[PDB]
Design a protein around this nucleic acid. Structure first.
Ligand SMILES: [K+]
Ligand SMILES: [K+]
Ligand SMILES: [K+]
Ligand SMILES: [K+]
Ligand SMILES: [K+]
Ligand SMILES: [K+]
Ligand SMILES: [K+]
Ligand SMILES: [K+]
Ligand SMILES: [K+]
Ligand SMILES: [K+]
Ligand SMILES: [K+]
Ligand SMILES: [K+]
Ligand SMILES: [K+]
Ligand SMILES: [K+]
Ligand SMILES: [K+]
Ligand SMILES: [K+]
Ligand SMILES: [K+]
Ligand SMILES: [K+]
Ligand SMILES: [K+]
Ligand SMILES: [K+]
Ligand SMILES: [K+]
Ligand SMILES: [K+]
Ligand SMILES: [K+]
Ligand SMILES: [K+]
Ligand SMILES: [K+]
Ligand SMILES: [K+]
Ligand SMILES: [Mg+2]
Ligand SMILES: [Mg+2]
Ligand SMILES: [Mg+2]
Ligand SMILES: [Mg+2]
Ligand SMILES: [Mg+2]
Ligand SMILES: [Mg+2]
Ligand SMILES: [Mg+2]
Ligand SMILES: [Mg+2]
Ligand SMILES: [Mg+2]
Ligand SMILES: [Mg+2]
Ligand SMILES: [Mg+2]
Ligand SMILES: [Mg+2]
Ligand SMILES: [Mg+2]
Ligand SMILES: [Mg+2]
Ligand SMILES: [Mg+2]
Ligand SMILES: [Mg+2]
Ligand SMILES: [Mg+2]
Ligand SMILES: [Mg+2]
Ligand SMILES: [Mg+2]
Ligand SMILES: [Mg+2]
Ligand SMILES: [Mg+2]
Ligand SMILES: [Mg+2]
Ligand SMILES: [Mg+2]
Ligand SMILES: [Mg+2]
Ligand SMILES: [Mg+2]
Ligand SMILES: [Mg+2]
Ligand SMILES: [Mg+2]
Ligand SMILES: [Mg+2]
Ligand SMILES: [Mg+2]
Ligand SMILES: [Mg+2]
Ligand SMILES: [Mg+2]
Ligand SMILES: [Mg+2]
Ligand SMILES: [Mg+2]
Ligand SMILES: [Mg+2]
Ligand SMILES: [Mg+2]
Ligand SMILES: [Mg+2]
Ligand SMILES: [Mg+2]
Ligand SMILES: [Mg+2]
Ligand SMILES: [Mg+2]
Ligand SMILES: [Mg+2]
Ligand SMILES: [Mg+2]
Ligand SMILES: [Mg+2]
Ligand SMILES: [Mg+2]
Ligand SMILES: [Mg+2]
Ligand SMILES: [Mg+2]
Ligand SMILES: [Mg+2]
Ligand SMILES: [Mg+2]
Ligand SMILES: [Mg+2]
Ligand SMILES: [Mg+2]
Lengths: 144, 64, 201, 117
RNA sequence: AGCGGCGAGCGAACGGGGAGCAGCCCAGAGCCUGAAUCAGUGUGUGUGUUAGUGGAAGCGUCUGGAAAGGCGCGCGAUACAGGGUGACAGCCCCGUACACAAAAAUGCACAUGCUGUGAGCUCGAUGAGUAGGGCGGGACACGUGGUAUCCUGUCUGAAUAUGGGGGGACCAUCCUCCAAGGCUAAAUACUCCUGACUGACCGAUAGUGAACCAGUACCGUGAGGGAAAGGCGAAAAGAACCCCGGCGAGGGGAGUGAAAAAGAACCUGAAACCGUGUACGUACAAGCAGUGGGAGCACAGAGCAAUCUGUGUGACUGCGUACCUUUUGUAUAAUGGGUCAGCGACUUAUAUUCUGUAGCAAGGUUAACCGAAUAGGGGAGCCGAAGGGAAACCGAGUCUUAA
């Protein structure tokens, strides 16, 4: 183990392409750009979504829907998250303290994802039917 | 710098669970009396983007 | 794991995960290379065609003279012209994940133990800040090119080692992977060993 | 890290010009012309390793024809006669014998004639 | 999120983590008084700045023009940073670590004088052609849009604390703030200029345009434009004297020097290009000038000899229309190149996706910042473990539909 006996892993360090350096390299002359046209030029190419002038897909289809501000302040909680809070009571504040939901979340819902194996009291959150069954079976209770 | 979303594409495509995109069908904005109810009914649900167009959509929506 | 002290003829108990793990050469290579990249200053520049001193006058008219067309006296094709892709100052540092840095250190220390390059002592000090005293002590312990890690940086030891170019003296919190590999031997005090164990968990 | 090209460029040009020795005018003096002359010489040599086999077989056949007609038989009948006699000597050797051992060549002609009769 | 011929593009805030942190005065009278606070001017104490002082330790022998190099034996180091000396020096020299130094001027921080300033309590007062409006513009991420808010060229015009502004058209309710007077350090931006130090920066066509008497020579009426050009040697010891020559240029000797094809047109001394000498070929012979075959001649070795081999040349002979580019297709009479040498074109930053590889793994990882720290801290955040629906919402389902 010396500064001149350390080697990188096999395959970790592929050499970069070097265009325009001779016939034998396989990228001489035109450097893979082919012959002429807009795409062979320096700075050449068409913008994203351009289709040659035909009405592009993102404009021949129609817009739809609206964006809901209330969705941005609502979160979902997994069953595996319940044991991560501090104290055995799960509410908005304890989830925020445990970094499970963001600081500006105002509404949260517990869903059946993962498992709960400890008794917990859920206060002030919505709980799905499956999650409520799992929590009560694990021995906890849900308070509105 | 950060890549900029094509905002117009963001208004028309939404990413689905396996990574495709759903969109609203064309031809249901106006000139509706002369179209059959069957045709319009089949235009009402959202559809998925085709394979040949997925590349253009993905290019427009780097943060989708 | 048991490390045998040299000056006290006793045994010291250390963590197997720290001092007895396998050598991960690819991981160590990445961390050593990133250290060397972190040492780079990256201070340089050349001038592009926009920054070479001169005027923007077209050297001669587009057509009729029988010369190749010219647009700028600063063209990189020209003698005295700009550098086509002129350099700018660069920051060459790499990110190393915390866990990869620690893993590399553990691998390096374990390899030192396996190669018998790690020497553990109860104490290492000199009476006065004199280079000659440290030279004599190292000669007595048959050490020439050595990194010495102490629990507390002894001022006398540091001063005595300054002018010996094969010899370095550090506290446990100042170890680095390149030094651990680069010095022929590594001497650690028992307190330094405990501190390194705690630091690497 | 700026790289000056002179030492390597000089070595490459010198390699080509060394391959161009003996050529006429700029072909042995001037890199641009010498390079083209070295390439063309290589192309001709590739072609003429194949041509050499043809030209020597053609020479051997001509000499065998002459020697066979000295002995009263054409080349084509001589070859057919040797083949009918199960004689597998090749044309290089038959031409060598035709020049250096005329008595042995006459013996071969007699073998061919006997096979043909 | 929004804005947007809803095109190209433009692009917040709320809220969170950090650096830094500091609050005050007038619109006024009485009491109490000269009380904090700054600003200025002296005076002292420290601490820098502007000259400086000391600063360790090596000899013998070999090679060599010269030793610092080789070899052998010593010595200093809080000094092995760096530079120089006839080749590479810790110990020859200048320095370096370290320890000291100021008659005089001056920066800063304290302390202490003098001058101005006012401190505290009570009772009051609380910025009008202003806010708001109509018209035209502009600024707000926000293009007049359903458009709050800000500014005002033009025309107007309140309430004034029992009052007024804002909470994105607008109204009610509630909450929150108090315009139309003003001052205010720090965290932030930059470098003409000065000192020190550093570089996987350049090394004379590079690096400044400028390594050199360069913003010069030169060009232009002028604004302005704007070069080329570095190296004898360790030391000038820079060649006394003689000879040819016009009391020349130039050269030959002599001498110096390690070297003079280091002699100032000076280190090395490439290539194009131009000569002298030698070997072979060449004056009956038709073309990309080579290539395959091949005689003779010259040369160097070897062999007792016969002769063989390496090198140079190449009579005669088969085959044979350069290169690049561009093209359906070029010997093309299509393009480009007089030749050489030097330079001359897929990069850099950030974002994003895929592959490889490494770490950790239902988790992974930190940013700014702190820290003397390539450590350590910092989990603000970001991605992932759940989706469906325009959405409310529901959730391993969901949407559709009366089903
Ligand atoms: K390509
Ligand atoms: K040292
Ligand atoms: K020549
Ligand atoms: K457009
Ligand atoms: K922006
Ligand atoms: K010596
Ligand atoms: K020295
Ligand atoms: K508005
Ligand atoms: K007004
Ligand atoms: K109010
Ligand atoms: K210039
Ligand atoms: K120049
Ligand atoms: K010389
Ligand atoms: K020179
Ligand atoms: K010369
Ligand atoms: K004739
Ligand atoms: K010959
Ligand atoms: K020929
Ligand atoms: K061309
Ligand atoms: K063309
Ligand atoms: K053409
Ligand atoms: K033409
Ligand atoms: K051309
Ligand atoms: K990439
Ligand atoms: K990866
Ligand atoms: K349903
Ligand atoms: Mg190819
Ligand atoms: Mg081309
Ligand atoms: Mg084309
Ligand atoms: Mg193309
Ligand atoms: Mg361009
Ligand atoms: Mg968080
Ligand atoms: Mg409609
Ligand atoms: Mg330049
Ligand atoms: Mg870190
Ligand atoms: Mg260089
Ligand atoms: Mg030549
Ligand atoms: Mg809000
Ligand atoms: Mg000294
Ligand atoms: Mg001598
Ligand atoms: Mg000596
Ligand atoms: Mg020398
Ligand atoms: Mg020297
Ligand atoms: Mg007011
Ligand atoms: Mg107004
Ligand atoms: Mg209004
Ligand atoms: Mg208005
Ligand atoms: Mg406006
Ligand atoms: Mg207002
Ligand atoms: Mg309002
Ligand atoms: Mg607002
Ligand atoms: Mg105002
Ligand atoms: Mg500064
Ligand atoms: Mg400076
Ligand atoms: Mg220059
Ligand atoms: Mg040079
Ligand atoms: Mg003279
Ligand atoms: Mg010489
Ligand atoms: Mg020299
Ligand atoms: Mg010279
Ligand atoms: Mg020459
Ligand atoms: Mg003749
Ligand atoms: Mg003749
Ligand atoms: Mg002719
Ligand atoms: Mg031949
Ligand atoms: Mg021919
Ligand atoms: Mg022919
Ligand atoms: Mg054509
Ligand atoms: Mg042809
Ligand atoms: Mg012609
Ligand atoms: Mg042509
Ligand atoms: Mg053309
Ligand atoms: Mg031409
Ligand atoms: Mg590229
Ligand atoms: Mg979802």
């Amino acid at each position: 183990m010396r500064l001149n006996t350390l080697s990188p892993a096999e395959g970790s360090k592929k050499a970069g392409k070097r265009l325009g350096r001779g016939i034998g390299s396989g990228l001489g002359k035109t450097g893979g750009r082919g012959h002429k046209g807009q795409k062979s030029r320096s700075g050449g190419g068409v913008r994203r979504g351009f289709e040659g002038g035909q009405m592009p897909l993102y404009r021949r289809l129609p817009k739809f829907g609206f964006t809901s501000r209330k969705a941005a302040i609502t979160a979902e909680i997994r069953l595996s998250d319940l044991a991560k809070v501090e104290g055995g009571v799960v509410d908005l504040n304890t989830l925020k303290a445990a970094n499970i939901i963001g600081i500006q979340i105002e509404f949260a819902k517990v869903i059946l994802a993962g498992e709960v194996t400890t008794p917990v009291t859920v206060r002030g959150l919505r709980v799905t039917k499956g999650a409520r069954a799992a929590i009560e079976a694990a021995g906890g209770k849900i308070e509105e | 710098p950060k890549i900029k979303t094509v905002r117009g594409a963001a208004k028309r495509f939404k990413k689905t669970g396996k990574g495709g995109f759903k969109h609203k069908h064309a031809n249901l904005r106006h000139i509706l009396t002369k179209k059959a109810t069957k045709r319009k009914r089949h235009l009402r649900p959202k559809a998925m983007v085709s394979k040949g167009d997925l590349g253009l959509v993905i290019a427009c929506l780097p943060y989708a | 794991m048991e490390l045998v002290l040299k000056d006290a003829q006793s045994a010291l108990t250390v963590s197997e995960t720290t001092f007895g793990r396998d050598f991960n050469e690819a991981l160590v290579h990445q961390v050593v290379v990133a250290y060397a990249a972190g040492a780079r200053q990256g201070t340089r520049a050349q001038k592009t065609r926009a920054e070479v001193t001169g005027s923007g006058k077209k050297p001669w008219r587009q057509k009729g003279t029988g010369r190749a067309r010219s647009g700028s006296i600063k063209s990189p094709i020209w003698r005295s012209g700009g550098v086509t892709f002129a350099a700018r100052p660069q920051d060459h540092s790499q990110k190393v994940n915390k866990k990869m840095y620690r893993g590399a250190l553990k691998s390096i220390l374990s390899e030192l133990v396996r190669q018998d390059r790690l020497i553990v002592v109860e104490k290492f000090s000199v009476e006065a800040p004199k280079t000659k005293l440290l030279a004599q002590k190292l000669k007595d312990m048959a050490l020439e090119d050595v990194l010495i890690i102490t629990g507390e940086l002894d001022e006398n030891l540091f001063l005595a080692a300054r002018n010996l170019h094969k010899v370095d003296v550090r506290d446990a919190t100042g170890i680095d992977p390149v030094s651990l590999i680069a010095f022929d031997k590594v001497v650690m005090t028992a307190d330094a060993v405990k501190q390194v164990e705690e630091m690497l968990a | 890290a700026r790289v000056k090209r002179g030492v390597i460029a000089r070595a490459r040009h010198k390699k080509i010009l060394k391959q161009a020795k003996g050529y006429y005018g700029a072909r042995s003096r001037v890199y641009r012309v010498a390079f083209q002359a070295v390439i063309k010489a290589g192309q001709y040599a590739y072609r003429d390793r194949r041509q050499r086999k043809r030209q020597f077989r053609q020479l051997w056949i001509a000499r065998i024809n002459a020697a066979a007609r000295q002995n009263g038989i054409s080349y084509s009948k001589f070859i057919n006669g040797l083949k009918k006699a199960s004689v597998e000597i090749d044309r290089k050797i038959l031409a060598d014998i035709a020049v250096f051992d005329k008595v042995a060549f006459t013996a071969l002609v007699e073998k061919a004639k006997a096979a043909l009769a």
